[PDB]
Scaffold this active site. Structure first.
Site, mmCIF file in Angstrom:
data_model
loop_
_atom_site.group_PDB
_atom_site.id
_atom_site.type_symbol
_atom_site.label_atom_id
_atom_site.label_comp_id
_atom_site.label_asym_id
_atom_site.label_seq_id
_atom_site.Cartn_x
_atom_site.Cartn_y
_atom_site.Cartn_z
ATOM 1 N N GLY A 108 50.801 36.660 -7.294
ATOM 2 C CA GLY A 108 49.460 37.192 -7.118
ATOM 3 C C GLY A 108 49.462 38.334 -6.126
ATOM 4 N N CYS A 109 48.371 38.487 -5.380
ATOM 5 C CA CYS A 109 48.313 39.509 -4.342
ATOM 6 C C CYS A 109 49.403 39.235 -3.320
ATOM 7 C CB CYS A 109 46.946 39.528 -3.662
ATOM 8 S SG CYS A 109 46.758 40.841 -2.429
ATOM 9 N N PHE A 110 50.070 40.289 -2.870
ATOM 10 C CA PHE A 110 51.252 40.120 -2.035
ATOM 11 C C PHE A 110 50.979 40.153 -0.533
ATOM 12 C CE2 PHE A 110 51.808 44.572 -3.907
ATOM 13 C CZ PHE A 110 50.946 45.147 -2.995
ATOM 14 N N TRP A 111 49.712 40.282 -0.154
ATOM 15 C CA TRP A 111 49.342 40.293 1.258
ATOM 16 C C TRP A 111 49.589 38.934 1.897
ATOM 17 C CZ3 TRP A 111 44.066 43.004 0.102
ATOM 18 C CH2 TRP A 111 44.300 44.372 -0.071
ATOM 19 N N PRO A 140 51.390 36.220 0.920
ATOM 20 C CA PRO A 140 52.838 35.986 0.974
ATOM 21 C C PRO A 140 53.528 36.728 2.117
ATOM 22 C CG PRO A 140 52.184 36.300 -1.280
ATOM 23 C CD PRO A 140 50.926 36.421 -0.466
#
Lengths: 204, 204
Positions: A11-14, A16
């Protein structure tokens, strides 16, 4: 001098980037786009790519098994999407990773009687995401960021550093301040900087 | 019976949905896509749209001024991106919002000598995002989710509810458990449910 690399997509990599980057054994992180065929991914122009993260880790401190566990806990791909493309992907670099992953997926699919829709494919290319996505939560707090950017003498120097990942991890509420004070001294910088860096940190 | 609506856009809508949904005065939240011209946005098919959030709030408890402040603190649009489209957008519904926003943007642009690249445009249409994005962090924890989904007797019933936003807010680490226990009793459900719901919660 020699480390190991995992490449995940969830999903969005922020989230993580701020999660993994706060786990011990994690040396560095880069967010980007992997899985597609176009040579020009960007945030709104993925093509067939997927929002991905590359984690440089020390296998002497953290296992690919532990990483895979974090990976499947940070999200829930137990729903069929997989729309047009695949949000949940594991990019293996060697057969070691490919087998642990194919196994651990088989474990949950059994232990839960519920099909996981994570793809396990060979890493073909990891395209690096735009700079304003790198250490996102850190780059937002502009005083702590501009201070650290100076100390490391460059943008790229900061984002590759372990410390940024930890900071960006802390700001995102993924780190007890005590652990940040540890990771801070592991750099051994002049006390004027330390106190100043620590100064912005205690004002929260 | 009658409430107010804000429509914001600030990158991935998971964080927001779990942030705003934990602020008091916030009645409900829906994530979706707004700002574009296509009639068919989806997660990887935005067209010109942007990842947006619709916040139903009580102006007697929370102001559009407070919301705008949260909005500009949850992210940093002080970088020029604005690539192809606009990540940072404020969708006004009446001239009241349009003026507070145009003013508060002017405030920061002055108080920081740094140009904010947030767009302020009239809401033309808010396209609702796919169900697996609704109360994301909540839907991931599948026991707490399936329990609440039953109590509310439907998917849509849960995600519109104030309680889901608070739960999904808590799971995302945006809420002290004490405040969740409050918002839990404000529903006044049979104690068997309460304890069971609270049960999953204390195991963290």
């Amino acid at each position: 001098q020699k480390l190991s690399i995992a490449v995940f997509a969830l999903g969005c990599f922020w989230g993580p980037d701020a999660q993994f980057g706060s786990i011990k054994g994690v040396v560095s992180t880069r967010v980007g786009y992997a899985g597609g065929t176009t040579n020009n991914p960007s945030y709104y122009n993925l093509g067939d790519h997927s929002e991905s993260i590359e984690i440089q880790y020390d296998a002497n401190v953290i296992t690919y098994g532990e990483l895979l566990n974090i990976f499947w806990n940070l999200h829930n791909p137990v729903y069929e999407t997989t729309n047009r493309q695949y949000m949940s992907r594991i990019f293996y670099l060697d057969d070691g990773q490919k087998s642990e992953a194919l196994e651990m997926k088989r474990q949950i699919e059994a232990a839960n009687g519920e099909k996981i829709y994570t793809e396990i494919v060979p890493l073909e290319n990891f395209y690096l995401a735009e700079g304003y996505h790198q250490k996102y939560y850190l780059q937002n707090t502009t005083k702590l960021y501009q201070t650290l950017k100076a100390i490391y003498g460059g943008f790229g120097n900061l984002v590759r550093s372990t410390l940024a990942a930890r900071m960006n991890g802390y700001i995102a509420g993924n780190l007890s301040i005590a652990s940040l004070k540890e990771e801070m001294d592991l750099v051994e910088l002049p006390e004027d900087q330390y106190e100043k860096v620590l100064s912005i940190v205690e004002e929260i």
